[PDB]
Structure formats: structure tokens, C-alpha cells
Design an enzyme around this catalytic site. Structure first.
Site, short mmCIF file in Angstrom:
data_model
loop_
_atom_site.label_atom_id
_atom_site.label_comp_id
_atom_site.label_asym_id
_atom_site.label_seq_id
_atom_site.Cartn_x
_atom_site.Cartn_y
_atom_site.Cartn_z
N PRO A 106 6.99 -5.08 -1.10
CA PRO A 106 6.63 -5.31 -2.51
C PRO A 106 7.80 -5.92 -3.26
O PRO A 106 8.92 -5.75 -2.83
CB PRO A 106 6.32 -3.92 -3.01
CG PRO A 106 5.73 -3.23 -1.77
CD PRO A 106 6.48 -3.80 -0.61
N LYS A 147 5.42 2.45 0.70
CA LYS A 147 6.17 1.61 1.65
C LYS A 147 7.56 2.16 1.76
O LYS A 147 8.15 2.60 0.75
CB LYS A 147 6.16 0.14 1.20
CG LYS A 147 4.79 -0.61 1.13
CD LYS A 147 4.26 -0.95 2.51
N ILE A 198 1.53 -6.71 -0.49
CA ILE A 198 0.46 -6.99 0.50
C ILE A 198 -0.40 -5.73 0.52
O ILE A 198 0.03 -4.74 1.05
CB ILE A 198 1.03 -7.29 1.91
CG1 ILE A 198 1.83 -8.60 1.88
CG2 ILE A 198 -0.11 -7.48 2.92
CD1 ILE A 198 2.74 -8.83 3.09
#
EC number: 5.3.2.1
Lengths: 114, 114, 114
Positions: free
Chosen positions: C1, C32, C64
Site C-alpha cells: 500500500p 499487510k 492491491i
């Protein structure tokens, strides 16, 4: 709506009033109240357009709706016109990317517009 | 096409010729004439990648078409190679976001490409 | 990110540790590892929000996946909160644009994430 201009034109060449003029012009163009318009000008950039360092600009306009074929043509005329008159940048040395944002993908005031 | 590089590498570490080299490499990679290529490099940024302030870059490539799985792999190899050789940024500290722009959503010369 | 904040708040008002705090917060929020989180703060900008030059910010979060209605509401509360606490920007003078990137459109390490 949000309009960002990145340009190699120097800060001293940006006239007083330029953000305010953009704000009012974009409110009128988009139909949104001026309170919703954000503008950002970034001068003195290291950039080239067509391999040349003559004045140029790389810009974006993001809006929840009010983006489309004819609208974007009208924005481009408006915004190139302003960049030419105020920053002395040739319209053929300007790119503007338009983005039609989904309301759910725009954060504001602790939440989103969805 | 328009390529933007934002980096914490200082201005003095950006070699002479870097924007020209990017212009020519991107013309070749995308198959567009160099007159269409815009490049923008923004050094000295306050940025971290993975919580580390070692050299890194956050980049974007916008193009009307010429964007897709295999093309974007090839652009990434090209562009990470240049960032590594010229700015001494490790490829695993680079993100490049690719955008396939619709011609209607790109302003230029008082109009759009539609 | 990748989280970017552009602001008119001056560089000296950005606290030491702000990038690290954003890194940790975004790792937690997105799920993440922090190694994947990139953060970029750009102070001292020439910008206006609603025609006013009071503190404001224009931000983006690209990821994503991990982007959607409820997640983006949550991210906006988090990120507005941090901007308010640390940079003294009112949440109603912040825009954050969210982008759900395809893995094939994200370059890294000489390739893409596809």
C-alpha cells in the site's frame, strides 16, 4: 472536486489570486459549491514535455461524477486557457488526467461520500 | 504517456540527462513518438518504504493504451533498471502504478484525445 | 500500500516519527506487513480547500485489494484522526482518494505483482 497542477514555471511567475481564480472557475464548471473545490499548484518542478523544458504542466482533476466526453473537453478548454493566460504555458504542453471517482472511494470528514 | 518519479534521493544525485534518457526510453518502450512523452522527477521527498528511509521511489506511468500484463512487466524492468543505475535505488524499493487512461479522460491542447 | 499526503502545513509542524506512525497504522489497517507499506508526506504546499488557505490535505491511498465501502470508511476515520492529532488539520479539510489497484498494474522489483 480536486485540481492539481504540476509545472516547471517558477513560483514567482504564479500570480496572486491564481488559486482563488481556479477555485471559482471550477465551482462554476462542475456545478459544485466552492466549499467542495480543492486546488493545488506545484511550481518549480523538474519536468519535460516532448523532451523540451519549455513551460509545461501535468495536471489532474478528480470529481465524483461530472466527468465525461463533452464535460472534459469543456474543462480542458477552461483550464488550458487559464494556464496559458496566467502561467504563459502553451496549451499543447499541458496534459490533464480526469478521474471520475466513486463516492465510496473518496474520504472526507472521517468518512466517505458513499 | 506521462511518467512521474517521486524520491527521497537528493536533487544533486539526479544526474544530468536523466529526464532526456527517460523521455527516449519511454518513447521506445511505448512506441509513441517522443513529442508525446512527459517526464517529471521530484527529488528530496519525505518518504519511507517499509518503514525505512533508505533510497526509494514511488512512481506512476499513465498512457492511453499500451498498458497490460506483459507490457507493464517490461516497463518495470526498464524503469527499475534506470532508477537503480542512475539514482542508486534498489528495485525492491520502487513502486510504479500503471494507468490505462481512456482518451476521453485526457486533456490536451484545449480539448481531449477522444 | 502507498499513502501520500500533500499539505500546506509547514515542514517544521510535521512531527518526527510521523512517517513511522503512518507505516504502523496502515500495516495494521490493511493487514499487510509493514515491509509493503510506503508513505510520503509533502508539506509547505500551495493549496486551498473551499477557497481558504487554512490547514488542509489532499491524500491518496493505493492498495492491491483491501479497498471498499466499509474499509474506506474505516481508513478515513483513522487517517483523518492522525492528520488532526499530528498536523492539526480539520477532518473536514481533508480529501483522501482510494484506489484499488490490479496487481498487473503495480510495478515492483523489475516486474509486477501479477
Amino acid at each position: 472536486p480536486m485540481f492539481i497542477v504540476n509545472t516547471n514555471v517558477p513560483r514567482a511567475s504564479v500570480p496572486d489570486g491564481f488559486l482563488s481564480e481556479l477555485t471559482a472557475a471550477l465551482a462554476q464548471a462542475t456545478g459544485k459549491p466552492p466549499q467542495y473545490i480543492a486546488v493545488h499548484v506545484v511550481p518549480d518542478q523538474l519536468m519535460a514535455f516532448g523532451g523540451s523544458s519549455e513551460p509545461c504542466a501535468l495536471c489532474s482533476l478528480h470529481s465524483i461524477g461530472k466527468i465525461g466526453g463533452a464535460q472534459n473537453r469543456s474543462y480542458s478548454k477552461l483550464l488550458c486557457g487559464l494556464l496559458a493566460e496566467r502561467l504563459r504555458i502553451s496549451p499543447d504542453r499541458v496534459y490533464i488526467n480526469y478521474y471520475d471517482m466513486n463516492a465510496a472511494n473518496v474520504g472526507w470528514n472521517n468518512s466517505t461520500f458513499a
